[PDB]
Amino acid sequence: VAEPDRPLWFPGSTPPPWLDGSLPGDFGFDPLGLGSDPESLRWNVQAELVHSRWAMLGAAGIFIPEFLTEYFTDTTTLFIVELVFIGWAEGRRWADILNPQKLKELRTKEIKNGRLAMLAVMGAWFQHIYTGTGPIDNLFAHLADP
Amino acid sequence: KGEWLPGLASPGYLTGSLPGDNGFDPLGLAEDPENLRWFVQAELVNGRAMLGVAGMLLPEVFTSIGIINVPKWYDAGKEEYFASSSTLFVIEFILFHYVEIRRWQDIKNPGSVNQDPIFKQYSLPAGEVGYPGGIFNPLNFAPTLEAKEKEIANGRLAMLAFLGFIIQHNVTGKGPFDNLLQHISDPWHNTIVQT
Amino acid sequence: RDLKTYLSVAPVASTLWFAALAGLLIEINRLFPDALTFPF
Amino acid sequence: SGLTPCKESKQFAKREKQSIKKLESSLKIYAADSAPALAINATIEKTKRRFDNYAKQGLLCGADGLPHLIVSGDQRHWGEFITPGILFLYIAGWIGWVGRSYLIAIRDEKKPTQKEIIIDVPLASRLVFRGFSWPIAAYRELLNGELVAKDV
Ligand code: CLA
Ligand code: CLA
Ligand SMILES: CC1=C[C@H](O)CC(C)(C)C1/C=C/C(C)=C/C=C/C(C)=C/C=C/C=C(C)/C=C/C=C(C)/C=C/C1=C(C)C[C@H](O)CC1(C)C
Ligand SMILES: CC1=C(/C=C/C(C)=C/C=C/C(C)=C\C=C\C=C(C)\C=C\C=C(C)\C=C\C2=C(C)CCCC2(C)C)C(C)(C)CCC1
Ligand SMILES: O=P(O)(O)OC[C@H](O)CO
């Protein structure tokens, strides 16, 4: 499943031996090498995944403020139940980590969008910090003038 | 039998021969077989909690509506005696002393199954260190086998149950049952989180 | 990337350990300063 | 124990007042609302608080007006030494037991000294928590807590 053809992030050239495009979304990226050990990558992979899956949903939180241009016992219990629940959830996911050609497409695409939310979900707050203003309108509200 | 965690896997010491085996010994205390045979005995005797935890719980809820007027379990120091307290300790000690050592021998060599002063009579007929049949089992129930795993499992919960009782008492300043019912005053706000 | 880990596993480990230990101890002292006894 | 408790002490009480007056003397040159101000006042409340707490917990205080600890074992003053002492030995053993457990696991095969200068083995498989129950090392004692090479 090797190819010198994958759309590298930096064209001509970008080939780290560990990355090969065998994985989905392999745009040949990792100068640091932040995973040159298969134990290193196999973990990073799962890590870069779950994150994305979450970030997407986070995005689904940016979907709600445009539909309209927080608890019955705030935090506390709401968290413990969360801890107790996502625990067991993430629990088993942990135990699994240590124990068709069509699908590649889906998964390559899944990561990239997923990559987007994180950069996204990120952006909306380091723009919100220090700078008390919502992003809700900014798309064409800040487009009025730089 | 089962496993406490799907990965990690059971140790070799936890064969499954013992009732209540679930491959849970992350630290490694019971790894030396002599070590187990002792901790197996300790788990049963500690576990058999049950007797007490039920002893501190049930009479507290029999005094629920006013059926009995007995003091709380943590208020029963005095004068719950027709002979005063200090009398009772010595009686409790001296004789428990006797029972405990005899029980002790059976752990090293079984044992002391026979009667003693008795001039012309039977003796306990049994096998197995942790469980002795005989009047200990007058009904003559089934030393099976699953119950042996039932016995444990219920004792283990009782233990955790005791740990709950004592802790909770502190902070919740009162009865483990008032406690229990203060939570029921429409919970979702009546949580340990409060304290 | 195996290399960075090991690197962090030499006597530096001691500094990180003692920094973490110091932080714990100081913070404990913040929440409970002037402690001449254990009263509970 | 010629000492009379920090509550009915006139010296230990006097010592409290002396310390806070000196602190108060310092804030007079900075003008409230300023930084060095709180820092001084925050120091004063801590001063009052620690003096207040010491009287609560007991603490006998000598004629000098400072608390003296009693380590005789007296039940009235267990918190002054025994209870912290029990806590120390617990952690002291825990460290001792975890460290011993490490050098033992290392010895078979490998280059043992390699693991000593570099420990890219963290708690080995999972050795730290083993200390939570160190006192069960009493049972290690009845077997082979000691090697029989030299003497008994
Ligand atoms: C006296 C109590 C007691 C004793 C002697 C045992 C003994 C044993 N257990 Mg058991 N167990 C207990 C209680 C006990 N257990 C409780 C309450 C639970 C519910 C989680 C379990 C769940 C359990 C499982 C799932 C398994 C065992 C197994 C075993 C056997 C092997 C492990 C071992 O040696 O234990 C060592 C003995 C000790 C460690 C006793 C000391 C423990 C510490 C000091 C107490 C901790 C106090 C508490 C946490 C303080 C508060 C903490 C704070 C954070 C709030 C051995 C016979 C394994 C087996 O195969 O059974 C045959 C098995 O897989 N146990
Ligand atoms: C294993 C631990 C343990 C257990 C399981 C118990 C269990 C019990 N204890 Mg005990 N206790 C313990 C440890 C334990 N304790 C310790 C360590 C101490 C310190 C000494 C005590 C000190 C203590 C005291 C001082 C007392 C108890 C009592 C009791 C009993 C309470 C219910 C009762 O009054 O009689 C059981 C309830 C009944 C038998 C109800 C039926 C009565 C019959 C049918 C008569 C019929 C009357 C009438 C027709 C019915 C109609 C009434 C209607 C109007 C409602 C219960 C058996 C009380 C007791 O001794 O009970 C007699 C009480 O006096 N305990
Ligand atoms: C709570 C809730 C509920 C409801 O629903 C709503 C809401 C509110 C919204 C919510 C939620 C939210 C969320 C979940 C969020 C999440 C997020 C995330 C995950 C992010 C990440 C994020 C992430 C991110 C950024 C990441 C990033 C990363 C990066 C850059 C990296 C880089 C790199 C790499 C690769 C490698 C190489 O060699 C180097 C470097 C250079 C180092
Ligand atoms: C009580 C008290 C007191 C006293 C004390 C005393 C006097 C005692 C003692 C003591 C002694 C006289 C002891 C001894 C001994 C011995 C020996 C012989 C030893 C040993 C050991 C070992 C073997 C250990 C080991 C280990 C561990 C286990 C842990 C870790 C470490 C190791 C690993 C090292 C006073 C009063 C002071 C105070 C108060 C309290
Ligand atoms: O087998 P379980 O699920 O009843 O586990 C026992 C509890 O942890 C307390 O006994």
**CATH-defined fold name of chain C:** Single alpha-helices involved in coiled-coils or other helix-helix interfaces
Bound compounds: chlorophyll A, the ligand CC1=C[C@H](O)CC(C)(C)C1/C=C/C(C)=C/C=C/C(C)=C/C=C/C=C(C)/C=C/C=C(C)/C=C/C1=C(C)C[C@H](O)CC1(C)C, beta-carotene, SN-glycerol-3-phosphate
* Computed Rg of chain C: 16 Å
- Biggest contact: C-D, 13 and 19 residues
Order of helices and strands of chain C: HH
Radius of gyration of chain B, rounded?
21 Å
PDB class: photosynthesis
Keywords: light harvesting, membrane complex, plastocyanin, ferredoxin, chloroplast membrane, photosynthesis
Entry title: Crystal structure of plant Photosystem I at 3 Angstrom resolution
Chain A: Type II chlorophyll a/b binding protein from photosystem I
What does this structure look like?
Chain A: Chlorophyll b 7 binds at residue 88. Chain A: Belongs to the light-harvesting chlorophyll a/b-binding (LHC) protein family. Chain A: Chlorophyll a 6 binds at residues 43, 51. This is part of a larger assembly, with chains A (146 residues), B (195 residues), C (40 residues) and D (152 residues). Chain A has four helices and no strands. In chain A, helix 1 (38-59) crosses helix 3 (102-123). Chain A has one domain. Chain A has helices spanning 38-59, 77-97, 102-123, 138-141. Chain B is mostly helical and 195 residues long. Chain B has one domain (3-195). Chain B has helices at 33-47, 50-62, 85-108, 147-169, 176-184. With 40 residues, chain C is mainly alpha-helical. Chain C has a single domain (1-40), classed as Single alpha-helices involved in coiled-coils or other helix-helix interfaces (Up-down Bundle), CATH 1.20.5.510. Chain C is built from two helices and no strands. With 152 residues, chain D is mostly helical. Chain D contains five helices and no strands. In chain D, helix 1 (11-27) runs antiparallel to helix 2. The longest helix of chain D has 26 residues, at 82-107. The two termini of chain D are 44 Å apart. The structure holds chlorophyll A (2 copies), the ligand CC1=C[C@H](O)CC(C)(C)C1/C=C/C(C)=C/C=C/C(C)=C/C=C/C=C(C)/C=C/C=C(C)/C=C/C1=C(C)C[C@H](O)CC1(C)C, beta-carotene (BCR) and SN-glycerol-3-phosphate.
